[model samples]
Target: DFPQHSQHVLEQLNQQRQLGLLCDCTFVGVHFKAHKAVLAACSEYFKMLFVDQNAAGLGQVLEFMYTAKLSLSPENVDDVLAVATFLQMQDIITACHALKSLAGTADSCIQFTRHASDVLLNLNRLRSRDILTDVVIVVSREQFRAHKTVLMACSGLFYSIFTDQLKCNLSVINLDPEINPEGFCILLDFMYTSRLNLREGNIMAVMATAMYLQMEHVVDTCRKFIKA
Candidate 1:
């Protein structure tokens, strides 16, 4: 009947919370900070939410998340299931686990959905296409062709520049020299294909580029590798 060790761990997490360690979590319109890294490591669902989820959602999930405590009465069961499903917590939970099992665990209870996905190829499409390109980005004296609309859709850095300071009608603009052209190869690969390869050697570099571009997904992917 020793629930002793687990209590100690919870106490430690709570203390860390109180000490204000990496506490960025906000719930029910209140800031209840915790380590974003820990939550993200715990589950990919948290990883998704860490990347600026819209601030309007039910508190039921937050209720469970914030304190690791929840009581789902029979009347509450259906709603909890609906919310969990929308959050894509775990197909198995909705399809299988009873409420007791849900209350029994402190670990990540979320799982990936089979049908879920994220994309591109044909890098040649942008290569030297003066006719189709509405904007030109000169990176490291290397003239790489690009379309304003596509780049805008792919990157907020591009979007903000194109829509605000620049009308995106400019014939050419010099990209920042700090950004590695080698990394741009990887970055542009992701922009086109919604794909990235993070080998040990290049992950940090890619992560740097990702943070610069506000590519949270890529940033997460890089961190996942870093953590591994």
Candidate 2:
């Protein structure tokens, strides 16, 4: 299908969710109609919710999606970025960042930089010892930082793997040559921040690494950026 054709099809799918009984995915006790494949293909957030059995962050996201000409404040930026990354909704993340950056350069809205900083801090601190963190992904000699529950909240692949490949005793897993350590860092950064830096000059390499790790959102974003 061409771009116009795909847009029409997707609109129909979204309309189906609103119109009939085809919506299989439930959120907030609402029997919202949506096709799993269509939802999964369009965004990774939907994939995790469907496959990983995964929140307020969620309710806010759905509300935001319901309206585009949204008058978002600095307060709403954090919510937008958090779920955008978790659910792999890149456009909102980009929009939030772009809007924030625009606020920075102008006298329009008061800019807030530290507002979204905690987006990564809490997860990055999970690299340290925490009673709650149950899984550790070691990349190279360096450790990958993330909260297991938080990460799994956004992961279908990670959830599926952890459940299936359990020694039932090990909390730490290692990925040496199978994944580049730096690339995995970028992956985590993206999951928390909802942005990727192609400015680092290893676009294809990181894209491949993300694919190997089953980060459909990361892989797809990189593909679209490269194509563009």
Candidate 3:
């Protein structure tokens, strides 16, 4: 049965290659252990699209697939997070969550803040103020309500950036006499999706969301976000 499964997977891989779904190299690189099972379990379309092009990206993916671990450094975090978000891989997303949690620690937060961009720095400043503290409170409270869950789960320092007035202002804007909810929703989507779709609109909004969500490293990765 195991051998039959393996053969079936190999056949599917061949078909995937012929259909231009998977690269020949990727098919050839499949591991011997449960390779057939893995291939057999994948969708026909997904099999074809499998290519081991980006080494770093593939490494992260493989780690998540096999060991359920995604080892990352501060420098490569933005790239990893981008791929994780783009691929919609849940394990990688969880790894990102873990890293983000680390950013709330005193040492990690300080180190990250020192090297962060202007937007991230502003958020970090808000976090340090301790007004309504959390590791992820990088912006005003108004911004917090915009995408509450991601920020609430983030570092403590990141949650304190906002004031009660700011929260009320967000409510007012949300209930604005003339404003539409589209812009606000877009901003919230960026926060939840971690995709910087709004480049020129509001840097502070993006920064606040990123900081509050413990994605401080991604605030400057707009180019990659657009690419993905």
Candidate 4:
């Protein structure tokens, strides 16, 4: 019998680890370097520790949660906006937007635009570049590389798969074979950028995919078009 492909994959991972390729974290005491994703998947403490370090604004936001105060300076506002969005802190997001308008100047308007745009812009940019991506979405013959955090944030189905499902494999997620790969692509883009690109050729497919994923954001947006 042929050797198991899963074992082959594990061997490849071990070799990659030995080579120090894609090892994002270096441990202190024992001088160990490892992939943050792997560690985070195995430990909640590591997840929090790694997340706090990567997003500097997040540590400040966490402090704000404990104490009812946030220091939002022009220099750090965009970072805060992005981190707040990632954490689903609507209050902080609203406050970040309000800070710009409250300043009441031309520079303030530009700052407002920056705060409004950077959250999605930065997220989409990461996806576009395939940076820090941790999951593979298989749609029939098409495969999409994306961040699990972004998917979990955007879709109920993804949240279920990534969290509720105890058997969630670390890598590939195979979607329903009947699902439209092209439409799924559009929906994935919308999740990252919050910009829906729907046309006659793909609108139905996109809608179906949105419904399947339980992405109410896309479904709600689609309804407005249907009603109009």
lDDT of 1 by residue, 156-213 (tens): 6875676564454576867788877667677765665455766788887889877887
Can you list the residue pairs that collide in candidate 4? none
Give the alpha carbon lDDT tens digit for every residue of 28-105 in model 3: 244322222122122122333432114245444433332324567676666767776665655456666677787733
Q: What TM-score does model 2 achieve against the real structure?
A: 0.43
Whose TM-score is greatest here?
4
What's the residue-level lDDT of 108 in candidate 1?
Answer: 37
Total clashes for model 4: 0
Q: How would you encode candidate 4's per-residue C-alpha lDDT over 131-193 as one tens digit per residue?
A: 557789999999999876557656778867865555355688999999999999998887656
lDDT of 4: 0.63
Determine the C-alpha RMSD for candidate 4 after optimal superposition of all C-alphas.
14.7
Worst 10 residues of 3 by lDDT: 107-116
TM-score of each: 0.43, 0.43, 0.26, 0.54
Error of 2 at 116 (Å): 12
Q: What are the runs in model 3 whose C-alpha is more than 4 Å off?
A: 1-24, 27-55, 104-228
* Candidates ranked by lDDT: 4, 2, 1, 3
